[PDB]
């Protein structure tokens, strides 16, 4: 199981990051499996964005909520995080983590990616 | 021989006192042949129930 974080890095203020997590080795059509987002400022604590179960349970950081939409391609194996209307304190490291099962109850975010840096910036 | 005839004195001649027939050495499974089952690992290993 791995996974892999792509879309834009630099962005204007005022504009929309996008970001697409494509994994290899877990599909969002087992039971327990689910997909989530989760940013940590540099130097700073870490930060939950989103997640999704996979009988397609949108759970939101609710401080973070009106702001955000995470969607899924399964097909492309792939999940999709939006978030409008960017600003400088958004520069940050974003991972896409996974959670799935254990062996007596529902495991989350076992595994990371690998972080795509985000400026917000001019 | 004396059994059959019940005698303690047989007499010269020939007499048919029993049968043999061998008897089998081994059995043989029993079996037509397989193929194929039903749907378990379908039942039981759904995804969503």
């Known amino acids: 199981i791995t996974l892999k974080e792509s879309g834009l890095t630099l962005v204007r203020p005022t504009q929309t990051l996008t970001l697409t997590c494509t994994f290899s080795?877990?599909?969002?059509?087992?039971?327990?499996?689910?997909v989530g987002w989760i940013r940590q400022p540099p130097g700073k604590a870490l930060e939950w964005l989103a997640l999704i179960y996979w009988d397609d349970d949108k759970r939101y950081n609710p401080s973070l909520r009106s702001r955000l939409t995470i969607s899924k391609a399964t097909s492309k194996n792939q999940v999709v995080l939006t978030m409008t209307n960017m600003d400088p304190v958004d520069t940050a490291t974003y991972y896409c983590?996974?959670?799935?099962?254990?062996?007596?109850?529902?495991?989350?975010?076992?595994?990371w990616g690998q972080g795509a840096l985000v400026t917000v910036s001019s | 021989t004396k059994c059959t005839l019940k005698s303690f004195t047989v007499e010269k001649g020939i007499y048919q006192t029993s049968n043999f027939r061998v008897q089998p050495t081994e059995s043989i499974v029993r079996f037509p042949n397989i193929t194929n089952l039903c749907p378990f690992d379908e039942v039981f290993n759904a995804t969503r129930f």
């Open positions: 080795g877990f599909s969002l059509i087992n039971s327990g499996v689910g």
């Open positions: 983590t996974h959670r799935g099962p254990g062996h007596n109850t529902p495991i989350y975010f076992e595994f």
